[PDB]
Amino acid sequence: LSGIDLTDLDNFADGFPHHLFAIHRREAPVYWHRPTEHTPDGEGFWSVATYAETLEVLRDPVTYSSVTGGQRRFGGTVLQDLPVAGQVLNMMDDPRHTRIRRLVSSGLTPRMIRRVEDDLRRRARGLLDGVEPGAPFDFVVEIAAELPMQMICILLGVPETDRHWLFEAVDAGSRLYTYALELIAGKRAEPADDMLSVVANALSDAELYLFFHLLFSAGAETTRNSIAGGLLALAENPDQLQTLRSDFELLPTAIEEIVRWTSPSPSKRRTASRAVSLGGQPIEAGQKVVVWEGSANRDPSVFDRADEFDITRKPNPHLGFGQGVHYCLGANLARLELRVLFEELLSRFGSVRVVEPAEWTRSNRHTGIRHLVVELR
Amino acid sequence: LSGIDLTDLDNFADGFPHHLFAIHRREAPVYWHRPTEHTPDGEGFWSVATYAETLEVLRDPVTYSSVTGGQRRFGGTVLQDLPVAGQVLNMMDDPRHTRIRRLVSSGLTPRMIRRVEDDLRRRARGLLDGVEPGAPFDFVVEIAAELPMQMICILLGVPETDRHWLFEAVAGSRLYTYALELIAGKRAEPADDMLSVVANALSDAELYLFFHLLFSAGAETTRNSIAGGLLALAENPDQLQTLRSDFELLPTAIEEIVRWTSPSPSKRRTASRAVSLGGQPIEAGQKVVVWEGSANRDPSVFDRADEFDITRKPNPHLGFGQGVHYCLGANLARLELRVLFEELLSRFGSVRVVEPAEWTRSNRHTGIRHLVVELR
Ligand code: HEM
Ligand code: HEM
Ligand SMILES: COc1ccc(-c2noc(CN(C(=O)Cc3ccc([N+](=O)[O-])cc3)C(C)C)n2)cc1
Ligand SMILES: COc1ccc(-c2noc(CN(C(=O)Cc3ccc([N+](=O)[O-])cc3)C(C)C)n2)cc1
């Protein structure tokens, strides 16, 4: 570990570096990672690679705060300190966290979920009906990116007309900002039956924009990555692809294994609020703690054959949707996207070939695939 | 006017559309511009094109707020309502405006001004010495953008090794995350610069908005004054020759450059009460847009208003604002202009614009994106 820099994004340019996290779990489940020239804030942090310790952190939100601790002015849930801490739901603590979490969740009505689902089935069919069998195309740009973008546009009440223009936005920061502000003002003047309207008509003007941005570039991006990643895992494990396409009652379990395997959000930060021990190491109030769900999800202490993709895997207590009070509000929506996409795809196609090497997102906050060129037959 | 859409940015694609504002001043100095598909917030606004009325709005900050008014949640100083109203200096009212304005000006010390000048002379000379005489080149990217970006880097204490990289930011992410560490460093280790002064006195989120504002707007307005000044002087080779022969004409010439280019040609406010402007009834909460760019060619105030004249006197232009929000950086912008043109004119009596200027498509900035020139 003394020669390994988890903050050097060159180590994440080619996918989540599971080899380095096997070293981390063996050598030091919990350890103090000294800052390098790549480390945000120039500051060291406790790094946690094992499942037990990751879960222990997630399950104690008083000790390990999503806001700040000690004398640190602001923290948040990514490695760099951000003043958005306290101002967006994922970066709030009780009591306001609970109030906002429930407000957002009250937007996920049965009818909204049907509205999402009906659109998703229509779209996934149209997209898969338009694939020329055998012809190479970029699965990420043509399919994986589209479905979740439409899902969150529907959740947030983005007019169908604006959706592709809005996507180019994720002058880009500017377009996004000035568009969302108008969309938000519209829902206040004229309430509509969507999540943005629920929330806007209940957060400060500024916080409502940060909420919009978050769903829009975390909810869409993570789900897109699960889909692209799942297709890649299935191309690389073709006997499992055949087993799965023979028996769609295997999909619930296959989907949980896709999320475990891909871990689209593989890292999470907190800030200690008090002296505490974790993994036998003394943490002081104010110090940063980074947990790596991407590593925890391959911990051989918890998962048998952890480095193998197994669509029949049970049990599967993965941490790819988080755990505890901040658990993914979108977990059933991401599963829904995955289920429909793979039902429609695997129905038509039993052969999936990746014809160029996957290009990965250069990041340790996301594990994502920017381009995936495939042939489906 | 009913056929003219001031929110359609195609009308600004080839420069500030002075001819349209000539129609505006003649037909209705103050008028209700109805919303079109191009209008932010889909909401109408009063448009003010004459000097008298523009000055009247700028000089009454209580009636014409830079935050909001009526029942509008938020306004600010651009046409679109923005929630940064109340959070950045230019979009604050008293009592907090005065407090922050004074803090920001305490940052402008004689030594800082000297630090800027020293750097500016060396750089300007370095850049002008590097020009191939007769060779075409983009004056905007090569010279006019660099000098003010360095100025604001010095004001804000941006380390020299970071500056080129920071400028590429003006992604949104990189500017935000970089600025946050810079600000934190000055808190940890105070330095002799304006960012340090302001950070060690504003919320953590307001310090970012302050950094973004200076770093963006301060550099861009000044850049545009520099490039537009070159262009006006190339189109008036007569006065270029006179100016080149007598550098004690620079102070007066620079005020004419600012009047003429008016890099910040529009400003928004929000009425806070019922009031009359230009004989038209404005209600509390309504938007008022003033156009300094039109006001600065108003023939009731300026003789031969449509002519560029370096010897123009008097020159009560509104290119730096007026009243309580008056530009804090006016001397700095004048200093950039003075040094650049001194060093350039020293070396060069001939300025040819070889391709036609490419303008920024904007009614918030009047700016040149590209100006290919030959100096001899
Ligand atoms: C496969 C796709 C997804 C993954 C892997 C993912 C993962 C996560 C994780 C790990 C967290 C916990 C954050 C923490 O502990 O700080 C979380 C929270 C969150 N997720 Fe997801 N998510 C996905 C899709 C979605 C979607 C589609 C939505 C849209 C509703 C969404 C909405 C949220 C929200 C609002 C939270 C914050 C909840 C809170 O802090 O109380 N997620 N997600
Ligand atoms: C030629 C270039 C410049 C132009 C045309 C310009 C123009 C303006 C104008 C018209 C205003 C009035 C804003 C309003 O009424 O809402 C203003 C304000 C401002 N200017 Fe400049 N400016 C220039 C350069 C700079 C520079 C270099 C600085 C760097 C210190 C600067 C700092 C500011 C600040 C902080 C304000 C806000 C002051 C307040 O609201 O109290 N400006 N400027
Ligand atoms: C102001 O700059 C930022 C930077 C990062 C964030 C950020 N918030 O969470 C994360 C990491 N992350 C998660 O913690 C999972 C997640 C959070 C929220 C949602 N969502 O759709 O609302 C999905 C996934 C995702 C983006 C991989 N990053 C927010 C604001
Ligand atoms: C989207 O968020 C914002 C924030 C601020 C602005 C904004 N603030 O002022 C203006 C227009 N403007 C001015 O009013 C003049 C000005 C203000 C401040 C500075 N400065 O260096 O601090 C220079 C010029 C300039 C940029 C042409 N625009 C616009 C959008």
Author numbering:
A (entry chain A): 7 to 176, 197 to 228, 238 to 412
B (entry chain B): 7 to 176, 198 to 228, 238 to 412
Sentences from the paper on this structure:
The CYP126A1 structures reveal a dynamic molecule, with the BC and FG regions clearly affected by ligand binding.
Unlike the previous ligands, compound 1 does not contain an azole ring and instead elicits a type I heme shift suggestive of substrate-like ligand binding. As observed for the azole-containing ligands, the binding of compound 1 elicits a shift in the N-terminal region of the I-helix to accommodate the nitrobenzene moiety, accompanied by the reorientation of the FG-helix region. As observed for compound 7, the BC-loop region appears unperturbed by compound 1 binding. Although still composed of interactions between the FG- and BC-loop regions, the respective orientation of both monomers is altered. Thus, binding of compound 1 results in a 155-mV increase in the CYP126A1 midpoint potential, consistent with heme iron reduction being favored in a substrate-bound form of the P450 (42). No evidence of oxidation of either compound 1 or compound 2 (which both possess a terminal 4-nitrophenyl group) could be obtained in turnover studies, and it thus appears that these molecules “moonlight” as substrates but are not readily oxidized and instead act as P450 inhibitors.
